[PDB]
Design a protein around this nucleic acid. Structure first.
Ligand SMILES: [Mg+2]
Ligand SMILES: [Mg+2]
Ligand SMILES: [Mg+2]
Ligand SMILES: [Mg+2]
Ligand SMILES: [Mg+2]
Ligand SMILES: [Mg+2]
Ligand SMILES: [Mg+2]
Ligand SMILES: [Mg+2]
Ligand SMILES: [Mg+2]
Ligand SMILES: [Mg+2]
Ligand SMILES: [Mg+2]
Ligand SMILES: [Mg+2]
Ligand SMILES: [Mg+2]
Ligand SMILES: [Mg+2]
Ligand SMILES: [Mg+2]
Ligand SMILES: [Mg+2]
Ligand SMILES: [Mg+2]
Ligand SMILES: [Mg+2]
Ligand SMILES: [Mg+2]
Ligand SMILES: [Mg+2]
Ligand SMILES: [Mg+2]
Ligand SMILES: [Mg+2]
Ligand SMILES: [Mg+2]
Ligand SMILES: [Mg+2]
Ligand SMILES: [Mg+2]
Ligand SMILES: [Mg+2]
Ligand SMILES: [Mg+2]
Ligand SMILES: [Mg+2]
Ligand SMILES: [Mg+2]
Lengths: 80, 123, 205, 156, 129, 82
RNA sequence: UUAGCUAGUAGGUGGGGUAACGGCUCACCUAGGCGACGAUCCCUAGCUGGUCUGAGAGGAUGACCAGCCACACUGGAACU
RNA sequence: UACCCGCAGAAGAAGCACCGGCUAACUCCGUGCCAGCAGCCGCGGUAAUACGGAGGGUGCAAGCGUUAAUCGGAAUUACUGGGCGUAAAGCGCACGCAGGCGGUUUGUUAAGUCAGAUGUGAAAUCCCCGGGCUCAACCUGGGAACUGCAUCUGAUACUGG
């Protein structure tokens, strides 16, 4: 109903902000091979609730910062 | 040749250089004659090829063959080279346009007459 | 933009008749139709594979009198249109106005048929048409107009049309000096010595 | 009734104590305007003698080709020793679109509508072997129906 | 390693035909039965049979017509190193329609001709010609 | 403001006008919003030389688009022929 | 035969600021951020619809027409 | 102005390249490794179809050649569509992280994939069927196409989870 994406959390060291690797799976435009392509996004989280290696689900919002325009909605597979 | 290898390192082509670099992708360039002289050719041939060392307009110093029989070419003469090499001369890559800005047409030539800048002989 | 030289010289090079003269006098009398023109005309050299493809295309051009740039455009149109490319190439040549004037026998030769077109003597569906390469759609009438109806060479040309074979796809009225291009001709309607496949292979290098 | 085309003549040599001995080779192919195609390769001291030996061997060892109406039946490939060869069934009246030695062998084969391309070495002896090898294993809609044990209509 | 079982199936058919073997056996699979289902139905092999409980062995009974082999050519198209998916408009015609292309679709594994009549495409397993 | 006007698209000496909807600050033959028909002033007998999608034209005028002086003649001529 | 780059830099809080979000600006706090899926640096370059070629896939290209962008002696700045 | 009508008389209107092989089209005379030609192979040293003129011919045509430039032929950077014993080409050998890939069975997921629908993919251009300029170039109506992306609804064989 609303557009959202998923991915691993790469780092969480800066407060109220995490960086999330969304790994899309595209075809090569020439050779036809399917290549994993990784997209890093800076995501605003309230309360610093995510960790490294965490899978997260994010949505797009108004720009919070210079490099940050994304906010998570919920967390799946929190633990190690 | 493996499809993973071409993703990581694609098929790079061969940037082919031009064998007439002084023209600089122009059809003809105006030059000034520095030295008009003759040259003996490679080993299967034997002649005295009339060929001139030319300072061009863009700044390059190339030598240029003078086609046809006879030429009124001197030093400090303003000619127009066009590109196209003489095989049997080492290093000559250009042809002078006969009939351009100082060079005269070939005297009394009646076949392939436009390749040497000679008017139609009216009866 | 027309060939103006000797006409049997073209027929001597091709080796056969191209119907470039009216056929009043027999063609073997006016020229050596079995000998190519020039000093070295008696010799028949071993003609190459590119030679027989050129001589076939130079045969068909010199019949209709079409230069190469315009004849190239008929190949582009015939390859574009559906069906057999070579048959469409002949169907476009048979659609020319100066051919229709010749096939109805209003001019004795195709050049004379061209000049009647070129000198504003032909009306197509009532309207005068000045272009030799005008395409003539089916179910169209095409007539000698009023002023040139009293020409000597027109009704003399209808005389020579009776010696020639009557084409099926037309319907001429020699009294009114008009006709009707009823349909486009079939490949079987035309000559059978023309190897149209040699021309198609030539423009497909 | 068997139309005969020579493809290429060639002068070869053979060095002996006296010097060079020259000889001539001739590559000819025959065909009936239908599936019977056959090529020949003769060699003698003289050019009219060499074509006659080539025409003699070409008239036997014919091979049969299941043609379509005037074209091939499916895009088939043929190789021999330098010459991978592609040829393709084509629409009506497009002509023989083929190169050099391949033009002569398909013309006496009785096809009239091909789209061809000769890759690799275009040596006329091996490329005329590559088309004959290419045309021989081309199979009909009848041949695949009897082989697979179905009707022609179940194959479409 | 056994990177691809399906290309092992096709190669054992191809080497089986060229060696004039009567039957060819191999370890069975859920996908290998569906391919042998098409090859028996389309007429390239005589019969298939899966035997055994712990490790099932798929046995293919080959088919020979007039001495020479029925399966003239058999090739793998989509492979684990490079997958091939086609839409229903871009399904191939093997040997101008004489051969078949075994295509894996959402409604099971079928031939390319039945894939067009079903109106949906998928992954091209192999060309059999 | 948004307007409805002609646009010269023809050969030399033989004009042909696309009647388009455009922001009036754009160029004549340049950027436009919606093509709502055409007009042919060298229109022969037995062909249409004027066809205007009047449902779209009445849609943009309801939005407040203005009409050119020549277009308002052509909206009249459609409503007199039809 | 460019491997490291970045201190308003990365983020937070609050203030200011804009038509509007925002390091956009400022104070403070945190130590981040980017990078081998090529950061940074260097050379070249207006981009596209398209055009040319080619059977196709591709290659080459961006004159005319049209869309967007940039610039108006050079370097700057703001006013209305 | 287009357009149309009248006048007069074949008048006022053909050139350029090329002709050894590739490559369509040949002879003669000058010339003697000179003068010169030339894209490649190569021609010229006294009988030159290769140089220059002539005759003849061939290709084009109000143009024709030359040069520059791009793709093609070139499957000669090969995705389609190549190779690596000896022709250019397997690292001296091995372990191994990232990466690529992965036996078999069931369930589940729907990411890939597949299907449908919607939105969008400006117009022109290209293509198709027509229409209009005496034809064509050109102009133009309708359509297809824009092979893409997004969202939604499914499908579950295959691949992934
Ligand atoms: Mg010449
Ligand atoms: Mg010359
Ligand atoms: Mg012209
Ligand atoms: Mg056609
Ligand atoms: Mg080779
Ligand atoms: Mg009026
Ligand atoms: Mg703030
Ligand atoms: Mg610039
Ligand atoms: Mg190609
Ligand atoms: Mg200035
Ligand atoms: Mg300024
Ligand atoms: Mg010749
Ligand atoms: Mg001598
Ligand atoms: Mg002599
Ligand atoms: Mg020559
Ligand atoms: Mg090339
Ligand atoms: Mg290529
Ligand atoms: Mg190789
Ligand atoms: Mg060696
Ligand atoms: Mg080696
Ligand atoms: Mg080794
Ligand atoms: Mg190593
Ligand atoms: Mg598996
Ligand atoms: Mg699954
Ligand atoms: Mg999915
Ligand atoms: Mg879909
Ligand atoms: Mg018309
Ligand atoms: Mg468009
Ligand atoms: Mg699974």
């Amino acid at each position: 109903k609303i557009r959202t994406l998923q991915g691993r959390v790469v780092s969480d060291k800066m407060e109220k902000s995490i960086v999330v690797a969304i790994e899309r799976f595209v075809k090569h435009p020439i050779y036809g091979k399917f290549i994993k392509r990784t997209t890093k996004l800076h995501v605003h989280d309230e309360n610093n609730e995510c960790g490294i290696g965490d899978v997260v689900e994010i949505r797009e919002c108004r720009p919070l910062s210079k490099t940050k325009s994304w906010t998570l909605v919920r967390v799946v597979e929190k633990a190690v | 040749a493996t499809v993973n290898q071409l993703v990581r390192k694609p098929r790079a082509r061969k940037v082919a250089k031009s064998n007439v670099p002084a023209l600089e992708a122009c059809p003809q360039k105006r030059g000034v004659c520095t030295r008009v002289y003759t040259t003996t050719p490679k080993k299967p041939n034997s002649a005295l090829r009339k060929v001139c060392r030319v300072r061009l307009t863009n700044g390059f110093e190339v030598t240029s063959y003078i086609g046809g029989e006879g030429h009124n070419l001197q030093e400090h003469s303003v000619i127009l080279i066009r590109g196209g090499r003489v095989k049997d001369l080492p290093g000559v890559r250009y042809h002078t346009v006969r009939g351009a800005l100082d060079c005269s047409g070939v005297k009394d030539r009646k076949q392939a007459r436009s390749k040497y800048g000679v008017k139609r002989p009216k009866a | 933009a027309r060939y103006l030289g000797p006409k049997l010289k073209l027929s001597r090079r091709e080796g056969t008749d191209l119907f470039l003269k009216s056929g009043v006098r027999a063609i073997d009398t006016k020229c050596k139709i079995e000998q190519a023109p020039g000093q070295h005309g008696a010799r028949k050299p071993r003609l190459s594979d590119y030679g027989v493809q050129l001589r076939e295309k130079q045969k068909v051009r010199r019949i209709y009198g079409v230069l190469e740039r315009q004849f190239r455009n008929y190949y582009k149109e015939a390859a574009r249109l559906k069906g057999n490319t070579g048959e469409n190439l002949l169907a476009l040549l048979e659609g020319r106005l100066d051919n229709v004037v010749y096939r109805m026998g209003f001019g004795a030769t195709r050049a004379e048929a061209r000049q009647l077109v070129s000198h504003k003597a032909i009306m197509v569906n009532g309207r005068v048409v000045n272009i030799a390469s005008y395409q003539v759609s089916p179910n169209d009438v095409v007539s000698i107009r009023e002023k040139a109806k009293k020409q000597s060479r027109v009704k003399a040309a209808l005389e020579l049309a009776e010696q020639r074979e009557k084409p099926t796809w037309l319907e001429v009225d020699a009294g009114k000096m008009e006709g009707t291009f009823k349909r486009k001709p079939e490949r079987s309607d035309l000559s059978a010595d023309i190897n149209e496949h040699l021309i198609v292979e030539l423009y497909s290098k | 009734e068997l139309q005969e085309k020579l493809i290429a003549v060639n002068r070869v040599s053979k060095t002996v104590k006296g010097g060079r001995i020259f000889s001539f080779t001739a590559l000819t192919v025959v065909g009936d305007g239908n599936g019977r195609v056959g090529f020949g390769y003769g060699k003698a001291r003289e050019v009219p003698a060499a074509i006659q030996k080539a025409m003699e061997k070409a008239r036997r060892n014919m091979i049969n080709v299941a043609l379509n109406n005037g074209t091939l039946q499916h895009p088939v490939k043929g190789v021999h020793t330098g010459s991978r060869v592609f040829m393709q069934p084509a629409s009506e009246g497009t002509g023989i679109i083929a190169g050099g030695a391949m033009r002569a062998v398909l013309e006496v084969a009785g096809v009239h509508n091909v789209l061809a391309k000769a890759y690799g070495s275009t040596n006329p002896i091996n490329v005329v072997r590559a088309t004959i090898d290419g045309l021989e294993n081309m199979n009909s809609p009848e041949m695949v129906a009897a082989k697979r044990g179905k009707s022609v209509e179940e194959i479409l | 390693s056994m990177q691809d079982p399906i290309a092992d199936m096709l190669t054992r058919i191809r080497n089986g035909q060229a060696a004039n073997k009567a039957a060819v056996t191999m370890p069975s699979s859920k996908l290998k039965v569906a391919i042998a289902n098409v090859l028996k139905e389309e007429g390239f092999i005589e019969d298939f049979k899966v035997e055994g409980d712990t490790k099932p062995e798929l046995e293919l009974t080959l088919k020979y017509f007039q001495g020479k082999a029925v399966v003239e050519s058999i090739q793998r198209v989509s492979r684990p190193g490079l997958r091939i998916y086609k839409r229903k408009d871009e399904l191939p015609k093997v040997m101008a329609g004489l051969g078949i292309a075994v295509v894996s679709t959402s409604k099971g594994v079928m031939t390319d001709r039945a894939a067009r009549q079903a109106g949906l495409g998928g992954e091209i397993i192999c060309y059999v010609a | 403001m948004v307007t409805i006007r002609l646009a010269r698209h023809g050969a030399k000496k033989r004009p042909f006008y696309q009647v388009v909807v455009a922001d009036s600050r754009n160029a004549r033959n340049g950027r436009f919003i919606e093509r709502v028909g055409f007009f042919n002033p060298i229109a022969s007998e037995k062909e249409e030389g004027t066809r205007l999608d009047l449902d779209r034209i009445a849609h943009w005028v309801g939005q407040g688009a203005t009409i050119s002086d020549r277009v308002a003649a052509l909206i009249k001529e459609v409503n007199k022929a039809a």
